[PDB]
Design a protein around this motif. Structure first.
Motif, PDB file in Angstrom:
ATOM      1  N   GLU A  22      -4.907  -7.577 -34.325  1.00 35.26           N
ATOM      2  CA  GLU A  22      -6.112  -8.007 -33.595  1.00 35.26           C
ATOM      3  C   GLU A  22      -7.092  -6.846 -33.642  1.00 35.26           C
ATOM      4  O   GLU A  22      -6.781  -5.782 -33.086  1.00 35.26           O
ATOM      5  N   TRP A  23      -8.191  -7.024 -34.358  1.00 35.40           N
ATOM      6  CA  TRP A  23      -9.281  -6.026 -34.401  1.00 35.40           C
ATOM      7  C   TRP A  23     -10.427  -6.502 -33.505  1.00 35.40           C
ATOM      8  O   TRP A  23     -10.285  -7.522 -32.801  1.00 35.40           O
ATOM      9  N   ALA A  24     -11.507  -5.742 -33.465  1.00 39.04           N
ATOM     10  CA  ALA A  24     -12.423  -5.771 -32.316  1.00 39.04           C
ATOM     11  C   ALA A  24     -13.269  -7.044 -32.281  1.00 39.04           C
ATOM     12  O   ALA A  24     -13.397  -7.802 -33.267  1.00 39.04           O
ATOM     13  N   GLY A  25     -13.854  -7.247 -31.117  1.00 39.00           N
ATOM     14  CA  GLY A  25     -14.782  -8.351 -30.866  1.00 39.00           C
ATOM     15  C   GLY A  25     -15.392  -8.222 -29.493  1.00 39.00           C
ATOM     16  O   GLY A  25     -15.731  -7.100 -29.076  1.00 39.00           O
ATOM     17  N   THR A  58     -15.657  11.567 -30.744  1.00 37.23           N
ATOM     18  CA  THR A  58     -15.686  10.188 -30.221  1.00 37.23           C
ATOM     19  C   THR A  58     -16.002   9.189 -31.322  1.00 37.23           C
ATOM     20  O   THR A  58     -16.582   9.559 -32.369  1.00 37.23           O
ATOM     21  N   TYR A  59     -15.683   7.936 -31.059  1.00 37.85           N
ATOM     22  CA  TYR A  59     -16.065   6.843 -31.970  1.00 37.85           C
ATOM     23  C   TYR A  59     -16.131   5.518 -31.211  1.00 37.85           C
ATOM     24  O   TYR A  59     -15.888   5.451 -29.986  1.00 37.85           O
ATOM     25  N   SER A  60     -16.495   4.478 -31.950  1.00 39.27           N
ATOM     26  CA  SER A  60     -16.613   3.064 -31.511  1.00 39.27           C
ATOM     27  C   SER A  60     -17.508   2.973 -30.283  1.00 39.27           C
ATOM     28  O   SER A  60     -17.225   2.219 -29.347  1.00 39.27           O
ATOM     29  N   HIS A  61     -18.626   3.667 -30.327  1.00 40.05           N
ATOM     30  CA  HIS A  61     -19.601   3.646 -29.226  1.00 40.05           C
ATOM     31  C   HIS A  61     -20.107   2.231 -28.977  1.00 40.05           C
ATOM     32  O   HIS A  61     -20.207   1.413 -29.910  1.00 40.05           O
ATOM     33  N   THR A  68      -9.356  -3.624 -24.664  1.00 39.66           N
ATOM     34  CA  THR A  68      -9.201  -2.482 -25.587  1.00 39.66           C
ATOM     35  C   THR A  68      -8.358  -2.898 -26.779  1.00 39.66           C
ATOM     36  O   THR A  68      -7.371  -3.631 -26.634  1.00 39.66           O
ATOM     37  N   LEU A  69      -8.709  -2.360 -27.936  1.00 45.33           N
ATOM     38  CA  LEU A  69      -7.723  -2.261 -29.025  1.00 45.33           C
ATOM     39  C   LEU A  69      -6.698  -1.212 -28.611  1.00 45.33           C
ATOM     40  O   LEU A  69      -7.063  -0.141 -28.083  1.00 45.33           O
ATOM     41  N   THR A  70      -5.440  -1.532 -28.845  1.00 46.21           N
ATOM     42  CA  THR A  70      -4.316  -0.845 -28.200  1.00 46.21           C
ATOM     43  C   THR A  70      -3.166  -0.738 -29.191  1.00 46.21           C
ATOM     44  O   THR A  70      -2.940  -1.678 -29.953  1.00 46.21           O
ATOM     45  N   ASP A  75     -21.319   2.588 -46.479  1.00 42.38           N
ATOM     46  CA  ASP A  75     -20.406   1.442 -46.693  1.00 42.38           C
ATOM     47  C   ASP A  75     -20.044   0.726 -45.384  1.00 42.38           C
ATOM     48  O   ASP A  75     -19.603  -0.407 -45.486  1.00 42.38           O
ATOM     49  N   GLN A  76     -20.209   1.381 -44.243  1.00 45.71           N
ATOM     50  CA  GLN A  76     -19.648   0.854 -42.975  1.00 45.71           C
ATOM     51  C   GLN A  76     -20.719   0.892 -41.894  1.00 45.71           C
ATOM     52  O   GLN A  76     -20.924   1.951 -41.284  1.00 45.71           O
ATOM     53  N   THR A  77     -21.328  -0.256 -41.649  1.00 50.99           N
ATOM     54  CA  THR A  77     -22.227  -0.499 -40.504  1.00 50.99           C
ATOM     55  C   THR A  77     -21.404  -1.284 -39.486  1.00 50.99           C
ATOM     56  O   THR A  77     -21.407  -2.518 -39.514  1.00 50.99           O
ATOM     57  N   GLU A  78     -20.641  -0.561 -38.681  1.00 43.37           N
ATOM     58  CA  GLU A  78     -19.608  -1.178 -37.831  1.00 43.37           C
ATOM     59  C   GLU A  78     -20.184  -1.606 -36.491  1.00 43.37           C
ATOM     60  O   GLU A  78     -21.243  -1.179 -36.074  1.00 43.37           O
ATOM     61  N   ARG A  79     -19.417  -2.440 -35.797  1.00 44.28           N
ATOM     62  CA  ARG A  79     -19.681  -2.792 -34.387  1.00 44.28           C
ATOM     63  C   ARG A  79     -21.163  -3.022 -34.112  1.00 44.28           C
ATOM     64  O   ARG A  79     -21.749  -2.412 -33.220  1.00 44.28           O
ATOM     65  N   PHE A  86     -15.163  -7.231 -42.758  1.00 43.04           N
ATOM     66  CA  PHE A  86     -15.616  -8.490 -42.143  1.00 43.04           C
ATOM     67  C   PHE A  86     -15.004  -8.479 -40.746  1.00 43.04           C
ATOM     68  O   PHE A  86     -13.798  -8.770 -40.602  1.00 43.04           O
ATOM     69  N   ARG A  87     -15.764  -8.038 -39.750  1.00 38.80           N
ATOM     70  CA  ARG A  87     -15.158  -7.739 -38.439  1.00 38.80           C
ATOM     71  C   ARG A  87     -16.217  -7.571 -37.363  1.00 38.80           C
ATOM     72  O   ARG A  87     -17.418  -7.577 -37.635  1.00 38.80           O
ATOM     73  N   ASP A  88     -15.747  -7.410 -36.140  1.00 38.64           N
ATOM     74  CA  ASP A  88     -16.539  -6.937 -34.981  1.00 38.64           C
ATOM     75  C   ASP A  88     -17.561  -7.980 -34.559  1.00 38.64           C
ATOM     76  O   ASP A  88     -18.744  -7.679 -34.429  1.00 38.64           O
ATOM     77  N   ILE A 132      -5.534   3.804 -26.732  1.00 39.61           N
ATOM     78  CA  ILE A 132      -6.639   2.819 -26.825  1.00 39.61           C
ATOM     79  C   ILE A 132      -7.719   3.404 -27.711  1.00 39.61           C
ATOM     80  O   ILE A 132      -7.797   4.643 -27.894  1.00 39.61           O
ATOM     81  N   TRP A 133      -8.555   2.531 -28.223  1.00 41.72           N
ATOM     82  CA  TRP A 133      -9.757   3.039 -28.897  1.00 41.72           C
ATOM     83  C   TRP A 133     -10.897   2.100 -28.573  1.00 41.72           C
ATOM     84  O   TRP A 133     -11.391   2.218 -27.459  1.00 41.72           O
ATOM     85  N   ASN A 134     -11.341   1.280 -29.508  1.00 39.78           N
ATOM     86  CA  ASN A 134     -12.488   0.349 -29.315  1.00 39.78           C
ATOM     87  C   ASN A 134     -12.350  -0.348 -27.967  1.00 39.78           C
ATOM     88  O   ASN A 134     -11.272  -1.003 -27.722  1.00 39.78           O
ATOM     89  N   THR A 135     -13.350  -0.155 -27.112  1.00 38.78           N
ATOM     90  CA  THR A 135     -13.377  -0.669 -25.733  1.00 38.78           C
ATOM     91  C   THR A 135     -14.492  -1.686 -25.598  1.00 38.78           C
ATOM     92  O   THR A 135     -15.626  -1.407 -26.035  1.00 38.78           O
ATOM     93  N   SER A 189     -17.633   5.342 -25.254  1.00 31.37           N
ATOM     94  CA  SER A 189     -16.931   5.632 -26.512  1.00 31.37           C
ATOM     95  C   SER A 189     -15.527   6.125 -26.177  1.00 31.37           C
ATOM     96  O   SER A 189     -15.276   6.449 -24.996  1.00 31.37           O
ATOM     97  N   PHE A 190     -14.649   6.163 -27.161  1.00 29.84           N
ATOM     98  CA  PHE A 190     -13.277   6.697 -26.980  1.00 29.84           C
ATOM     99  C   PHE A 190     -13.190   8.058 -27.667  1.00 29.84           C
ATOM    100  O   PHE A 190     -13.928   8.336 -28.620  1.00 29.84           O
ATOM    101  N   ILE A 191     -12.283   8.893 -27.187  1.00 30.27           N
ATOM    102  CA  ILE A 191     -12.008  10.232 -27.754  1.00 30.27           C
ATOM    103  C   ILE A 191     -11.057  10.088 -28.938  1.00 30.27           C
ATOM    104  O   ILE A 191      -9.978   9.491 -28.780  1.00 30.27           O
TER     105      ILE A 191
HETATM  106  O1  LIG Z   1      -8.969  -0.622 -35.406  1.00 27.96           O
HETATM  107  C1  LIG Z   1      -9.945  -1.455 -36.092  1.00 27.96           C
HETATM  108  C2  LIG Z   1     -11.353  -1.461 -35.441  1.00 27.96           C
HETATM  109  O2  LIG Z   1     -11.801  -0.120 -35.427  1.00 27.96           O
HETATM  110  C3  LIG Z   1     -13.118   0.008 -35.933  1.00 27.96           C
HETATM  111  C4  LIG Z   1     -13.763   1.095 -35.069  1.00 27.96           C
HETATM  112  O3  LIG Z   1     -12.754   1.929 -34.439  1.00 27.96           O
HETATM  113  O4  LIG Z   1     -13.132   0.458 -37.295  1.00 27.96           O
HETATM  114  C5  LIG Z   1     -12.158   1.463 -37.636  1.00 27.96           C
HETATM  115  O5  LIG Z   1     -10.999   0.892 -38.272  1.00 27.96           O
HETATM  116  C6  LIG Z   1     -11.240   0.278 -39.544  1.00 27.96           C
HETATM  117  C7  LIG Z   1      -9.919  -0.274 -40.062  1.00 27.96           C
HETATM  118  O6  LIG Z   1      -8.976   0.780 -40.304  1.00 27.96           O
HETATM  119  C8  LIG Z   1     -11.814   1.277 -40.522  1.00 27.96           C
HETATM  120  O7  LIG Z   1     -12.143   0.618 -41.749  1.00 27.96           O
HETATM  121  C9  LIG Z   1     -13.061   1.906 -39.944  1.00 27.96           C
HETATM  122  O8  LIG Z   1     -13.463   2.947 -40.828  1.00 27.96           O
HETATM  123  C10 LIG Z   1     -12.780   2.487 -38.570  1.00 27.96           C
HETATM  124  O9  LIG Z   1     -14.013   2.947 -38.042  1.00 27.96           O
HETATM  125  C11 LIG Z   1     -13.708  -1.416 -35.877  1.00 27.96           C
HETATM  126  O10 LIG Z   1     -14.899  -1.510 -36.707  1.00 27.96           O
HETATM  127  C12 LIG Z   1     -12.460  -2.307 -36.108  1.00 27.96           C
HETATM  128  O11 LIG Z   1     -12.493  -3.676 -35.483  1.00 27.96           O
END
Ligand SMILES: OC[C@H]1O[C@@](CO)(O[C@H]2O[C@H](CO)[C@@H](O)[C@H](O)[C@H]2O)[C@@H](O)[C@@H]1O
Length: 417
Positions: A131-134, A352-355, A69-71, A285-289, A202-204, A45-48, A365-367
């Motif tokens: 399926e990516w995050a939301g 860790t990531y995807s806090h 979770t993304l799985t 480049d990446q202001t995620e989540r 274009f996500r999250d 798992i990662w993004n929770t 966050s996930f390890i």
């Molecule tokens: O798995 C996609 C999901 O993961 C996030 C955070 O974990 O972004 C990661 O995956 C992206 C696609 O490979 C990468 O571009 C990004 O660098 C990485 O952090 C989410 O933002 C995304 O929905």
């Protein structure tokens, strides 16, 4: 007429980014132990994404905490992942997770020690390869859920799918997630498209009810519209840099932004794209989540980013960044002066990531990767220790470490159907 200052994107500038301190104990995540437990021997798992209502309250259902979770499958017998000595290389399998990502759910009456529930959408339902995050939004006491997520390949589209959570005294099921609805994709005038940039984001999606207006909006990650390489790091993107720090290098290739959309209805059905809230041209480049905490009548806007996606001549840690405003549409200022809220320690820069900062101050966050020696490391794909932060004006402070994957509810919802 009472004139108001017009809405404008807040710029996260190079000068702001020069303030990033990777060695501040008040903004550093606690060290993850090399002996961390792993929640599944079958899946990574990662993004929770905790279940929550439209107002941002983390929700249990009939006492059951629920996370999405993304799985991705673990593939220990795949020939593609056997090294020269015929041994499984977990790093190759872990790196391939994004291309095979699916939504699962998990549940627990304690907010930790999660029980796996399995895939949310049955085989054939998802229109895309990934399926990516939301955000899973609990709608009502019938247990109806709108799962907003990113449908990836072909394209990257913000979508939603309606289903229902059902509980018994033994566990939780997710039923009826059958019809994925397209909401919006990048437009090309405000948000960058794949035609403009093969590496566009274009996500999250993060839907919410604005506490002031009661209107429905949605944050998402994007890039500033324009052909890749066409952007300019001008005086506003550079900001108030000190002497000798005027060279932007090739940082016009870094064009992250936090986007926002508005809904025409209370049901989250018909959305209109608005111009971005925060832009980071020349900075990252990446202001995620992107996600909100509403506290003290202010808007705390968090985003997750990487060391590796910083502009030329800038650096900082992987982790949580954020901004604060008195108003939904700004102006925002960077938390702690730089924007850095919770950076990975430089000794374990990828721990860790995807806090996700929840309104109770707890950050899940996930390890990812934890060093265990000079050359050796462990892959996680499992929950990290939760950590409490405090938001105070335009400052944040790390307070206290909690158990692996601890995600307690803020509200309980009584569900029957
Ligand atoms: O798995 C996609 C999901 O993961 C996030 C955070 O974990 O972004 C990661 O995956 C992206 C696609 O490979 C990468 O571009 C990004 O660098 C990485 O952090 C989410 O933002 C995304 O929905």
């Amino acid at each position: 007429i009472q004139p108001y200052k017009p809405t404008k994107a807040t710029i996260w500038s190079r000068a702001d980014a020069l303030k990033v301190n990777e060695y501040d104990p008040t903004t550093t995540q606690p060290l993850v132990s090399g002996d961390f437990p792993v929640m599944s021997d079958e899946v990574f798992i990662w993004n929770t994404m905790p279940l929550r209502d439209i107002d941002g309250n983390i929700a249990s259902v009939n006492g059951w905490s629920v996370i999405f979770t993304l799985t991705a499958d673990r593939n220990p017998t795949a020939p593609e992942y056997q090294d020269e000595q015929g041994n499984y290389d977990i790093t190759l399998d872990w790196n391939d997770r994004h291309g095979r990502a699916k939504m699962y759910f998990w549940y627990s009456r304690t907010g930790k020690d999660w029980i796996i529930g399995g895939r949310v959408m049955a085989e054939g339902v998802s229109p895309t390869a990934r399926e990516w995050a939301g955000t899973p939004v609990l709608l009502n006491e019938r247990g109806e859920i709108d799962l907003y997520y990113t449908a990836v390949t072909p394209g990257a589209t913000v979508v939603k799918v309606r289903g229902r959570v059902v509980t018994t005294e033994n566990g939780v099921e997710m039923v009826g997630f059958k019809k994925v609805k397209s909401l919006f994709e990048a437009d090309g005038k405000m948000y960058q498209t794949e035609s403009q940039n093969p590496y566009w984001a274009f996500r999250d999606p993060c839907p919410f009810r604005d506490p002031k207006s009661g209107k429905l909006y949605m944050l998402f990650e994007g890039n500033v519209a324009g052909e890749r390489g066409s952007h300019v790091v001008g005086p506003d993107e550079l900001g108030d840099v000190p002497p000798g720090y005027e060279d932007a290098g090739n940082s016009h290739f870094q064009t992250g932004c936090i986007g926002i959309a508005v809904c025409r209805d209370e049901d989250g059905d018909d959305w209109e794209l608005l111009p971005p809230l925060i832009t980071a041209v020349g900075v990252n480049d990446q202001t995620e989540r992107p996600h909100f905490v509403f506290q003290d009548g202010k808007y705390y806007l968090f985003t997750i980013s990487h060391k590796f996606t910083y502009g030329d001549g800038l650096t900082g840690p992987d982790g949580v960044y954020g901004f604060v405003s008195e108003n939904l549409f700004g102006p925002y200022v960077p938390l702690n002066g730089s924007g850095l809220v919770l950076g990975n320690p430089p000794s374990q820069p990828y721990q860790t990531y995807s806090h996700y900062v929840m309104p109770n101050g707890l950050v899940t966050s996930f390890i990812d990767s934890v060093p265990t020696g000079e050359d050796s490391y462990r892959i996680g794909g499992t929950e990290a220790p939760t950590v409490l932060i405090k938001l105070k004006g335009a400052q944040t402070f790390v307070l206290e470490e909690f158990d692996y994957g601890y995600i307690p509810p803020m509200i309980d919802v009584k569900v029957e159907h």
